[PDB]
Each structure stands twice: as C-alpha cells, then as structure tokens.
TrEMBL record, chains A, B, C, D:
Annotated GO CC locations: cytoplasm
Cited InterPro entries: Cys/Met-Metab_PyrdxlP-dep_enz, Cys_met_metab_PP, PyrdxlP-dep_Trfase, PyrdxlP-dep_Trfase_major, PyrdxlP-dep_Trfase_small
Entry keyword set: Pyridoxal phosphate, Transferase
Enzyme class, broadest EC rank: transferase
Domain of life: Bacteria
Modified residues (N6-(pyridoxal phosphate)lysine): K198
Name recorded for this polypeptide: Cystathionine gamma-synthase
Signal peptide: none
GO molecular function, one term: cystathionine gamma-synthase activity
Enzyme nomenclature, EC number: 2.5.1.48
Gene Ontology process terms (BP): cysteine biosynthetic process via cystathionine; transsulfuration
Transferase as UniProt keyword: yes
Length: 379, 379, 379, 379
C-alpha cells in the first residue's frame, strides 16, 4: 500500500540493473541488438515500438492512475488522436463536452467528422442530457472535469454507469486535475487521457501526452496504434515528463493553496463579475468536486464586468503571471481563451465568453501573485 | 546557387539574433509569452503548433529537397499517418508498392482500410501496371525507390505523369536514398516522406519523420494536421536530426563507397545466390537508378543458397555488423526482413523471401566490414 | 520585494526576447557569431567564457543567495577548486571544519597541501578555537553548517566577524541547508559554495557546483579562473539544475516535514544510540540553528547501539531508502559515511564514527519512509 | 587490427547488456545503488568519480590515440588544468611553445606562475632550442603541432627523446590534428591533450576536453585529480562528443580536401602576403608534417598585404565563413587571432601578427567557400 508520492518517484523506476544508476537512463537510441534473429534483449527491438525510458514513464503513469497499462505520446493531442483512431471507425458517434479544450473540439469536428465520426456536445454536468444523447452508434463519452476553461464538474462514477449501460467507453481527460487530485479509473472510467505538457511535466518545458487504461486488451489495441501510427513521446521528453512527475504532489499542494488565496482576492473585487473555481461552495458541481477530487486545482477563471475590453487589458497588464497559452507549470500563466486557446471554438456550442480570463496559478510566493493580479485589475 | 553540403549546415540555421549562437538553441519550452493577446513574438505561440528548433529542421529539409515547406514528426510512421489523414478520406483508394517497409503496409492495410480507404499493391517498376491500377477514387500513388528491402527502382518522373494525369498525388518515400542522392520534387513528386530515423539523423539515436512539399497549400493542409493531431518531433529530437543532417553528404559518400566494396565481396561468393544493389548493371531498373540517383546507396540485400536456415545463421554470426532493425546509421546493421522488419508483410503481396538478408553498410573501415561478412558467410 | 519562490522561477529567466519562449533555451553551442571583430552580440563570444543558459542559472543563484554574482561549475568539487585556486597561493593557510564532506578534506589535504597551502581542522561550533586557529597566513575560514555528516552547527555571523577581524574571507558551503533555509551572505559570509548536485538540482540527475559572492571584484577574480581553468557547468546540466531550483521551496518544505517525522521514529528506538538533527532541542547548536535557519533540513544521522555491524545491516536492509552516495534528491538515500562518502577522512581529525548511518530523507509518502526504517532497524 | 573508423564507432560502445540499445545511454544520474555497503554495481558509485556515458567516451578516445586510459573534462582548458595540477608543483618548470592557444598561455602565465611554476616559451620547431631550455626543475615539454594559429610543426618523436633524456614528460596538444591525422603516443608522447570542443565533437555544440595516456600509473594520478578537483565532462556533453567522434574520419577527409582548395585560392591572390598551411612544400616543417600527419588539416592562416586594417575587413565581409572564436566544426569559421583568441598573448613572446586571419575550413561545398573568400578579399 505505497503512497502516491512514493509511487511517483519509484514506480517503473527501479535502479538500473547493470550500473545501479538511481535515475532511469535516457535511451537515446533507435534500435537494439538481438541475440540471433528474434532474440530480444529485455524485450526491446525498436524505439517506436518500445523504448526503456518511455516504458518507465508509461509504468509510472499506470501506477499513479491505478491502471494496467500506460502509453506515452508526442503530445496530448496525439494521445487523443491515437485513442480515437483505435476505438472509433466511420459511422460511429462520440459525445463530447459542451466546454472543452479547443484542440479536442478541433480534432473531433475538423478531422474525425471528415473521417465519418458523428458527434454531439452535451452538458456533462447534466446526466439526463448525457443519457438522452446516447445513440445506437455511440462508442464513447468524452469527459473533461474540471472543464477547460469554465471548470465545470462531471460526476465520473455517474457517467461511467451511463456509458457502460450503452456498451460505450468512458474517456476522462484528467489533465487539469492530475492523478494526484482525481483518479477516474477508480470511479469506472475506461481510459484516462492526459496532456503531460501540463501538471505532470510541470515546468512548461515538454509537450507530451499519455493514455492509461484499466483493461489490458484495450491497452494492447492502443499499443498497436502507438506502434503503427508512431505518435510516440521521444525518450528525452519522456524523461523530463517523468522528472516532473516526481514533484507533482508538492507542486499541486502549493498550486491549490495559491489558487485558494487568488480566489479570495478575486471574489468581491469590484471589476470582477464572476469567479469560477470548483472549491467555491456555490460553484456549479461543488459537491461532486468534493466527493471525487482531493482538492480543487490550480486553475481559476473569472469574468470582467467591463467585457472583452477589460479582460484583454488585464491579460496585458500582469508582470508575474505570463500571458501565454498552456497551464500547469510552476510559473503562473494568464490567457484570454476566446482569442487564444479557444479561438478554435468560436461559433460552436463550445464558444467561451469574451469577458473571461483563465489563470494557471503557479507556485510563486502567493503575495506576489495576489499583488500582481490586483494591479492588473485596477482600471 | 549554394551547394547541398552548404545548405545542410546553413539553411534554416542563421546564427541566433540575440546572442550570435552559431548552433540553433534547443527550445525546450511548451509556450511563449505574447505582447498583449495575439501579440506573437517571432510568430510563436505553442510548441505543438510551431517550435523554433523544429522550424530550423523543417526549413533545412525543405531546402535540401527543394520544396516550399517541411514538417517534422514524431517518427517516419507519424509523418505517413499525418499525410494520409490529410489527403485521404473514407471511399478513397491508394496505390502502394509491392515491396515496401512493413510498417507502411501495416498502417495502410490494418488502420486506413478499417477507416474506409481501399488499396492495391502494384509493381511500381512497371508503369503499365501503375497506369491500369488507377481507379476513379485513387487519391495518391505511394512510391518507395529503392524499395525496402529488395531495392527495386521506380521511375519517379514517369509515375508523376501517370499520377497527375489521374488528378492524383505522387508521394515518394525518399528514406533510403536521402535528399543527397535523389530529389523527388525535382522529378514531379508532390510529397516527399522520410523516416529521419535513418540516414538524415544518421546515428541510430533519434526516431523521427518528415514531409516536404512543393505546393504551399498542401503544406498548410498538412500543417493543420501536424498541429491538430499533434504527432510532432520534439525539439531535442529535431535538434539531433538537424545535427545529423550536417554530415549527410560525407556519410553517404562513404556509405556508397563501402556498399560498392561489400557488393564486390558478395557477388560470386559460393554461399550467395543473388545480390540486390541498384549499382549492379543487371539489377532490375539499374538505368533508371543511374538517371535519378547521384549514387546507389548504402543498402545491400542478398539471398543465401542454403535458404532461411543459412540466412538466419549469417545474421547471428556477424561481429561488426549489428543484428537489429533499422538502417542508415554510421554503424553497420544486418537483419532478416522475413522475421524482423517485414514480419508484418507475411502472407501478403509484400511478403519477402525467407532466404534474404538485408545490410545497412555503415561507415566503418571497409576491410573490417568485408572480413566480418566473409567469416559470417563461411558455412 | 519579490519572494523566494518567485525569484527561483523568474530571476535570470525573463521570457526569450525573439520568440517569447517562457523557459530559457538550452544553448548547446560552443561559439557565437560577432558583428565585425569584437562586435559581440549580447556580450557572448565563447561558451567556456559565458553561455546564456549558464548565465540564467548564475543570475538565479545570485538572486536566491542575495549576492552580486553567481558562477556555475562542473561539480561542487570544481567550484571548491576554482575558489581555492583564486583566493590562495603557496604559503597561505586555511581553517577547515573538523567535520566536513570527505571530498573537501581530500582536495585541501591531498591537492592544495602539495601546492603549498597549510591547513588546520577546527571545531567551528567553538568560536574560541576558530579565533585562536587564525595565523598571520590565514586567507579563509571554510564553514559547513550543518556539517556533513554529523549536522553540527556554526554561527555564521560570529565566524564572519572573526574572519574579517583577521582580513580573511568567510566561505560557507551552504549545500545541506540550501538558500531556501539559510542565506550566509546576509550574515557576513564573503562566498557561498554549493554542490548543486544536492538540493538545488534536487533529482539526483545532474552533478554541478556554484559560487555566489557579495563583492563584485572577488566575483571578477573568480570569473577569470572559471574562464581560464574552464571547469564550467555545461548548458544542459545548468538547465536541469535551474529546472530543479524552481521546486526547491516545495521540495525542502516536504524534506523538513518528512525528516521531523523520521527523527520522531528514531528517537527512543531501542536499537538507536543517538539521533543527530539540528531541530532536536538538545542537539549541539540547536539555538544557533533556530536563529540562522528557516527550518532544520532533510538530513538525519544516527548511531546504532550494535556498532559498525548494526549500521552496515541497516544500510543493506532499506527497500525505499536507496543505499548510495549523495543527498538532496526527491528520492530517499541512506549511506554509511565511514566506508562511503567519508572513507577519505579515515585516520584524520575528520574520521566519522563507524556506527553512524546518514539519511537523506526524500519527499516520498512519510509513512512509507518510517515503515521502511522501522523494518530495517529490527535486528 | 580494427581500423580507425571502426574503432571510432565501436570502441567503448558495445550494445547495452540489458536492452541491446545500440547507442550508449545518457546516464543522467548523480549516483548509483550499491548492493550492501561497497557492493558496487558494474564498478559505479558517483558520477564525478565515474559515469558510464563518460567511460564510453574515455575508452573510445583511448582506443583512437592508442593509449591505456582516457579522461574526459568540462573543457579543453580543464583537461590542461587537471594535467598540470597533477604533474607539477611549486618550484617546477615547464617549456611551452612560442605559438600556442592564448588560453594555454594564460593558464600557465597567469595561474600556474602565481602558484610557483616557472616557464619558458621556446621554438619547438628548433630541437636545439628545446634541448637547451631544459632546466633541472623541468617536469614537462608542452607541444602543440600544428601550432595555433601559425600552424608551425614540431617533430614529436625528436622532442620525446629530448624530454625523456631529461626525465621530463612530453605533452602533445593534438587538438588541431585529431587522432585521425596524428597519434602522438605512437611517437613517444606521454600525454595527449584535446579540446574535444574542436574536431572530435565536430559540430560547434559541446565544450569539452580530454587527456589520453600511455602509462596506467600516470592515468591513475590524473584520475585522482579528475575525481578530487571534479572538472568532469557531464554525461550529455560526453554523449554528444562521442556522437561527433563517429564521423571524425569522413569529416576530416573533407576538411583536408576543402582546405587544400582554399590554399590554392589564397596562394598568389594579390591581397594575400603569405599563406600558412602544413601541406605547402615551402611551409616551415613541411617534411616533418609529411612523416607524422596522415594529411595536413582543416586550418589555414594567412597574412593580408594591407595590414591589420585589411585583415579586420576580410573577417567582417565573409557570408559563409562565420566570424567567431573556435574551430573544427562542420561549419566554416574565420577570426582575427590578434583581437580574438590570442588577445591574451598580446605583449608576450606568443603575440600573433596583427595582419593575420585564421580559417577553420568547414565541410560546406568547396566552391561556396572559395567564392566567399574571394569576395571578402576583394578591396
Ligand atoms: C495550448 C494547450 C492547452 N491545452 C491543451 C490540452 C490538451 C492538448 O494537449 P497538448 O497541447 O497536445 O499537449 C488536451 N486536453 C486538455 C484538457 C488540454 O487543455 C491550453 O489550454 O492552454
Ligand atoms: C524498423 C524501421 C525500419 N524502417 C522504417 C521505415 C519507415 C518508418 O520510419 P520510423 O521507423 O517510423 O521512423 C518509413 N519508410 C521506410 C522506407 C522505412 O524503412 C527498417 O526497415 O528497419
Ligand atoms: C558524493 C557526494 C556527497 N557530497 C558532496 C559535497 C560536495 C561536493 O559536491 P560534488 O559531489 O562535487 O557535486 C561539496 N560540499 C558538500 C557539503 C558535499 O556534501 C555526499 O556527501 O554524498
Ligand atoms: C576559443 C577556443 C579556441 N581554442 C581552444 C583550444 C584549447 C582550449 O579548449 P577549450 O576551449 O577549453 O575546450 C586547447 N588547446 C588548443 C590547441 C586550443 O585551440 C580557439 O582557438 O578558437
Ligand atoms: Mg532499468
Ligand atoms: Mg530495471
Ligand atoms: Mg460570433
Ligand atoms: Mg534563431
Ligand atoms: Mg534567426
Ligand atoms: Mg506462408
Ligand atoms: Mg534570454
Ligand atoms: Mg532575455
Ligand atoms: Mg583507524
Ligand atoms: Mg553499457
Ligand atoms: Mg556494455
Ligand atoms: Mg604592442
């Protein structure tokens, strides 16, 4: 019964057999010598197929999510693409969230639709809407919780039962929460998706993705697509992601504490119309968040009274929060989803409000973050 | 009119503006600060979308193939997958070679067929067979030349005219030849594919892929899929591939000279039934190779008189050639395609002979390579 | 008045000017293009002299210690060697601690003595002994606090006054405490030394050293030796050290909390004769530690009742603590100084007790660490 | 009797035992798990002491120079510093060249002199001057051949006999020639020094140094200083140096051929007063170069008729040759030693002529290099 922080450092990461090296080597190699034809050493043959550094990351992620198999990819989006290429085909249907990362929307609507996959965007916070959106062709329900960027909450255990009753898979994109705060497989999810670019790598310095599954056969079907389509994490990126994972617990603890302080500063600020944070008792889905999340995350969104004009001004004015896409780094980030990460959802059911600002609250000294926001908000 | 070796070192690789750093930095970053919302610095916003180290590799590859746009991917197979997802849809048809990398076959037959793409494998050395294989649904002709592993030759300029007459694209997988020996865009190809894992990286230490195109609009459609599906080369892998490219000319020169010597040792060896090398005057397609290749490459295949049993024994017995998948490294590699790279083609039109051995002749001292083969061949 | 955690992420680490890259690039370059002879771009000319990634690490370390200049080296020992080559010459004298890293002892006694530098080892916890050890030739007092491995405490401010009265420099090796817990320059130290291999890098994956100084002229004399002797941190190692520094605060917080719990488990364990931890009220120098350290660190040493035999058995029996040299990693480490890090002090005034075990308490889940020690201690 | 190119790829570089990885892993680790106290795995204990990636580079360099032991350092200058700290002490004397890298001069005159080592600069092309410069205190003769930047030649075998008759060591800095062109240990040198930054790494992207010795005991004394002073090559830099070494033969072949063409363009150019190249029959020491070098190198120096003013203009005007310090990269470099690499020798016996330009002729297409020089030379 090893604890999460122990697993993050040790799972998949036994000291090297030959040398005792305490950290997994970077196997910057394409290929592997065989002892006679098919005589694999340690099961390795070609780095696309499997690479020992990538195996370490895959085994660690499986341990942290409580799954049987992890698979690492070149980006979050490549994990999504390999997943959907594996579980869908022409004629199938997907339920996606009505608030989700714009790239997810873009991949489903602009690539998979052209390849014959139908879809509907549903309010996943409303289990009735999810149950009635099921079609005979539905292969999967795609869940983000909290959603990007509104931080809406979906009851994983409830939606798992709806998916399974329809013989569909439940996919949970656990990027925002991370395995430290939320463990979807433990609530009946079939697949967990991550952008490891975010909290897992933790340092805004490595683009990557991952899948973790409960079912070994689905894991083998995904692995066939990992090998065949080849959208793999390279060994050095996998190595940096794994290095980041070692501090996930201590980072997330501080992200959550700093975000709670930032929410206190935003609530009742006269220029702020609305604060979105799953820890606020009146946030939609707060009680679901309390039952399925250890803590409420580092992400905070808010709507400016003065509209788009005011939101764009705040974004430009921060001196510690950096105006950039992405999230989950040690460094604080700010963005305007409507013109940045979610420009790809303009005109759709997933369009974000133009008065919204999204924060990734970092692990900087909290007074510096609060003071930076307060000066940026001053009209 | 800069020469190839000059471009390989300089194209895309001006010294850094701020510091003068003569080598492109490794931009190990996920994201980029914007000067106000949408105020991109140098056009950068998020590493999946574009990363400055990956841009350098993409611009260099475009210069070497004479194309307008390069795109770098997580592997050769991911370049293939992004290409086919972009140019095909359900109902389309592909012509592929009757001798090709087993992964290419596997991606088309085991993934794209399930996604509604029909295909036929054709002898691309026979332009009549190619012309009659065109269907009204054909979107592309997929060419390897020389083929993996038989080293058969296809007349690029001839097949370009057949493709274009049918309003189809000509795709040339130029992995074996490299841009130093063969420039398909100059002969009317629409798309060049590479596994950069092979001769471009050159050191068996980085899995990667690339696409280069002549047409800027097709380049933008591919780039949309690079971003959306996210199967990108990470910056450190891109950086090592670019480092490898700097020595492509001098490496390939030596691969070709060492391969010619190895072919001399194999021809007439009493245990060798047949030697496959495009430089042999009686090799099928020799005259086409002379007109479209600067030299005939580092790859050599041969068939053992004593059958599969003899081929497997040679593979196990080399002490300088390493028994492993892959090719195009400085180090010599040997394999048995039937049980290794082309196990995925068993039972298909692309099945390889069980008595065949494939060599990637490296840049080691040639007498050591010849002597190693001669001892391995001795029964 | 930016806080420590803010500085650790931001100092020296403004977003890239050209691209906005939020993380400092890895300038894996030897040299830099000049605009006419001596026309340096951004002040760069040759990576040994200065490298932009190494400058970022050097500026960050200067900010965290409150110094004017940082300098990064190939290892802790190379920082020590460059320091001593700069400030000493034949005929000079050094005061060193009577308990110190064995490599420090080895460099002074086995290299600098042969090069004409005399030395004495003194109890730095006894300011009278330090004051009477001053000789007319004394150039520096070399302080570790806490000491490696007994964790003895030296009053930095007191020893600074003794050094300065003698026109000598006070050097503090702040490796064990890190800048998060202790800031020697603020108490009158002239030079801070680190093995960045330990808590600063934080992940047992990069050997490196650093110097930070208060006085810009001493900084320039050291920099002349950094350039001339060339024992520099390479850019990728500097980059990983800088990545590690971003989480120093959150890591050290957890190291200190886990170490306090481990000390509770060891105190009164029937096999344990003595527990060494600066936070124990009866530890020698506890009151000095309270006034100069924010918290008492991740290191814990203890002496077994059953002697050397019992200590060696504990070292071999841990399953979560890894038996290895080094310290300050996220992963827990255990060692026997007498036969490992301090074999080099056997027979000297710095000989360690043979019944002593040294712990680097990591950031694993604390119950797993306590349970691992308790099973290892059971006879 | 394996050949040089074979050794460069294979020596020290057997495929990984556990996984078969064909390329040496990057052991980005500080420490190594022991099986009981002192139970080393594969002989590893701490990365400063030894690191498996650095061991591979050290073993490869030993094979290429024909020595018993290689040692890798953080820079060329750090290799020099560790060497001199090992073999000299206060009161000793060194003979150095009268034309040498300015950093070598700076380390000896500005650091080791202050530490009690006397020195004289001698014309090493004149064995009589070398023999009469020997003092009873002389511990070593330090040889560059060809010299930096005049490319003067020293007869290694002759100077070895002079050194050995005096019970002194012969040190040869073989940076410019590389082990591919010249093997000083085979001619009686005791120590070979390299800046691996130059031709060995080969890509202007990794600062590093090395020592190789014939005598295992001197190797152990040097290794004690490598460990104790800690000026080690880090594993990723060692790995890139080793990657570079794989193409040394093919690169140097092309450097030598391109340099011979550049010399033809410079000889008789009306603006050029003198061309310095060891392959010119009238170059001082040409016959010695023919007997001890396989070929005459990539470096070319020349003196402008129009003095310093003309030399500085040429340096600024090249568009393919990059104006920067350093040499031995695939990319062509140009500099003015008097104001750049050898500003540190101004006012000494090693002062370089102010009308001199130094070229590192790269492996770009030769016509582009010749045409670039011809336009830069045009007044
Ligand atoms: C610019 C990127 C942001 N997000 C990405 C993202 C991805 C896609 O992950 P890669 O970017 O492909 O690693 C997947 N799933 C979720 C919930 C995400 O937010 C961002 O919002 O700021
Ligand atoms: C094990 C791999 C071998 N080949 C690969 C390959 C690829 C696929 O490239 P990635 O392996 O995805 O970079 C694409 N195109 C060609 C003509 C190829 O040979 C091999 O044969 O030995
Ligand atoms: C094996 C190394 C251990 N220590 C090292 C050390 C260094 C030397 O630092 P590099 O090892 O050269 O980075 C300097 N200063 C202190 C207080 C140290 O403890 C160890 O104890 O376990
Ligand atoms: C800027 C550096 C140049 N040279 C360096 C050098 C070194 C010193 O090697 P690191 O620079 O410490 O790796 C040692 N030995 C020789 C014959 C050298 O030329 C240069 O000349 O352009
Ligand atoms: Mg392992
Ligand atoms: Mg293992
Ligand atoms: Mg609208
Ligand atoms: Mg640039
Ligand atoms: Mg530029
Ligand atoms: Mg059959
Ligand atoms: Mg910068
Ligand atoms: Mg800057
Ligand atoms: Mg004793
Ligand atoms: Mg090995
Ligand atoms: Mg081995
Ligand atoms: Mg003068």
């Amino acid at each position: 019964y090893e604890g999460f922080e122990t697993l993050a450092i040790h799972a998949g990461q036994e000291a090297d057999a030959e040398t005792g090296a305490v950290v997994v080597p970077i196997y910057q190699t394409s290929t592997y010598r065989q002892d006679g034809v098919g005589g694999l050493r340690g099961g390795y043959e070609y780095s696309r197929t499997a690479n020992p550094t990538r195996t370490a990351l895959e085994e660690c992620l499986a341990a942290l999510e409580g799954g049987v198999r992890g698979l690492a990819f070149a980006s979050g989006m490549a994990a999504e693409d390999t997943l959907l290429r594996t579980i869908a085909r022409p004629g199938d249907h997907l339920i996606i969230p009505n608030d989700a990362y714009g790239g997810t929307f873009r991949l489903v609507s602009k690539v998979f639709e052209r390849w014959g996959v139908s879809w509907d965007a549903v309010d996943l916070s409303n289990p009735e809407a999810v149950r009635t959106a099921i079609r005979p062709e539905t292969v999967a329900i795609w869940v983000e919780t909290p959603t990007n960027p509104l931080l809406n909450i979906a009851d994983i255990a409830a939606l798992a039962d709806i998916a399974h009753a329809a013989d569909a898979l439940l996919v949970v994109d656990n990027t925002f929460a991370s395995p430290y705060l939320q463990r979807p497989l433990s609530l009946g999810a079939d697949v967990v998706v991550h952008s490891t670019t975010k909290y897992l790598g933790g340092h805004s310095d490595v683009v990557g993705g991952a899948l973790v599954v409960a079912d070994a056969e689905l894991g083998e079907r995904l692995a066939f697509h990992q090998n065949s389509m080849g959208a793999v994490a390279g060994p050095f990126d996998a190595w940096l992601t794994l290095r980041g994972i070692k501090t996930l617990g201590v980072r997330m603890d501080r992200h959550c504490a700093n975000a709670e302080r930032v929410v206190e500063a935003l609530v009742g600020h006269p220029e702020v119309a609305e604060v979105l944070y799953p820890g606020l008792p009146d946030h939609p889905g707060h009680k679901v968040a309390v039952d399925q999340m250890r803590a409420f995350g580092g992400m905070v969104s808010f709507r400016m009274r003065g509209g788009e004009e005011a939101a764009l001004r705040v974004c430009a004015k921060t001196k510690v929060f950096t105006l950039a896409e992405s999230l989950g780094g040690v460094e604080s980030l700010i963005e305007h989803p409507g013109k940045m990460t979610h420009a790809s959802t303009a005109g759709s059911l997933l369009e974000v409000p133009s008065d919204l600002v999204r924060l990734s609250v970092g692990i900087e000294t909290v007074d510096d973050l609060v003071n930076d926001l307060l000066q940026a908000l001053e009209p």
